[PDB]
Amino acid sequence: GSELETAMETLINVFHAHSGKEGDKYKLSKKELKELLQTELSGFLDAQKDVDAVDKVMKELDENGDGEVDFQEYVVLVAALTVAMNNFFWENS
């Protein structure tokens, strides 16, 4: 498998483990998601009031409007954040 595929598997393992740790194993609640990204993602720095925006972005990602996310919503949710790291990269180099 390509390195991209190797990296991809990582998303499932972390999603499954963290999701499994709290709440229903099958579903990840927003509360679990917020804690997951805040701790695991550099966004921790954005934990301040900026973190509130996290609530705002969930609405757009969730077509259901349910407030809950599925693996499909999660993969795109992290993908959007990934772009931010790219922005950060600009700061270095």
The answer to whether 53 contacts a second copy (rule: CB under 8 A) is no
- State the minimum distance, in angstroms, from the CB of residue 28 to a second copy: 14
- State the minimum distance, in angstroms, from the CB of residue 37 to a second copy: 9
Contacts of 37 (CB under 8 A, 6+ apart): 43, 54, 78, 81
3-class SS at 9? helix
Kindly state the tokens that stand for 72: 């499909």
What is the 8-class DSSP label of residue 26? S
Q: CB of 11 within 8 A of CB of 54? A: no
The answer to whether 57 contacts a second copy (rule: CB under 8 A) is no
Contact footprint for Ca ion (CB under 5 A): 19, 23, 28, 62, 64, 66
Contact footprint for a second copy (CB under 8 A): 1-14, 39-42, 71-72, 75-76, 78-80, 82-83, 85-86, 89
